[PDB]
Structure 1
């Protein structure tokens, strides 16, 4: 019987700070217990400082990325080359996702960029097709190994400030560029040994006001 949607693995983590918003994901592509490709980039730039990555079945994500590019390029055709905001492209994706609702495609899409105020904004797309504005969200089977850890070092959840017992917790503090990179490197490194689909090497795309910078990090191939 034909399988409606498969799972090749992979883990994507979006992060939005007080200034920039980054996005990452691994290069490991596997099928069951065997590795398919050692480095397959799953992350590409869609333009206008909007980086889209789909975590889920491959061809469903491939058909989503290829048709999203033709939708953005058509947006500039009728509007005579006007910039597309990240909040504008987030709604148009669900319209493409709901049209296929009769043949559900399983994908987790996380986009990164900047809003009209300049702050980093991340819009995560559920496999049902709904989305919501999220400060930081992961995806895939390893998302459970990430999400509770970042809330400790970012949102400072359930961490009290030294000197105050049973009163208030540590207030929200902003992190620099290097501090966010250390959060990304340590997230996939610990998930490399504890998850079979995390490993190989890491592609970090940093989206700032000056442009988009791509950074490579090497995980354990095992």
Structure 2
């Protein structure tokens, strides 16, 4: 019997800062126990200061990103070159996904950028279109390895202030872009050590008011 779905592995991570946002993803692409490519870009600049990644089955991932980029283009044509706000993009992506409710895009989609007040924004989608704004979200193969670490190191969960002994929580102080990138790199380094589908390279797209910037880092190739 023909199976229209496949698993291309990969792991992605979106983090929303105070006045910035990052969307990171490894560059390894796989089937079963084989490596297809050590560098196959997974996170994309979709224009209007929005970055996107659709992780899971790469064919559906590419199809969705392609259709969303197309939706940005037609939004400009139809509405006098108006900028597509991150919240509007998120709702649009829901309808793209739900359009195939009964034959879904087998991907876990994350977009990142800035909201209309200039604050950092990340949106997270399931395969069939349920979405939600979030501060922190890992997706893909090593998501279960990364999220608990982020709960602890970004949101300071289970961390209390010394001396008080469980009475006063550690305060939720804002992280800089340099601080976030450290946590992203350590998340992927750890994921690379303990997950076979994660490795080769890490590509991070950083979104600010100035635009979209890229950073690349090597990962272990075993």
Q: Specify the TM-score bucket, using the shorter chain as the normaliser.
A: over 0.9
Cα separation, 1, equivalents of 2:18 and 2:75: 29
Deviates most, 107-116 or 95-104:
95-104
Please name the residue that 1:43 is paired with: 43
Q: CA RMSD in A?
A: 0.9
Q: Is the 8 A contact 2:55 2:109 kept in 1?
A: yes
8 Å contact kept, 1:5–1:105: no
**When the two structures are aligned, how many residues end up with a matched partner?**
222
1:128 Cα deviation from its structure 2 partner: 2.7
Q: 2: CA distance between counterparts of 1:166 and 1:113?
A: 36
Q: Which runs of 4+ in 1 moved over 4 A?
A: none
User: Could you tell me which residue of structure 2 aligns to residue 7 of structure 1?
Assistant: 7
Kept in 2: contact 1:154–1:173 (CA 8 A) = no
Deviating more after overlay: 160-169 vs 15-24: 160-169
Deviations 1:44-90 (A, max 9, x none): 10011100100110111111111111111000001111111000010
Contact 2:64 2:105 in 1 (8 A): no
- Structure 1: where are the runs of 5+ without partners? none
Question: Matched residues in 1 for 2:60 and 2:16: separation?
Answer: 26
- Quick one: distance in 2 between partners of 1:94 and 1:2? 28
State the Cα deviation string for residues 138-188 of structure 1 (Å, max 9, x = none): 111200110010111111110001121131210101111211111011111
Does structure 1 retain, via aligned residues, the 8 Å contact 2:100–2:128? no
1:36 Cα deviation after fit: 0.6
More displaced, 48-57 or 98-107? Answer: 98-107
Helix, strand or coil: the match of 1:192?
helix
Q: Distance in 1 between matches of 2:104 and 2:177?
A: 38
1:129 shift after superposition? 1.6
TM-score norm. by structure 2 comes to 0.97
CA shift, 1:102, in A, is 2.0
CA deviation string 1:187-209 (max 9, x = no partner): 11111110011110110111011
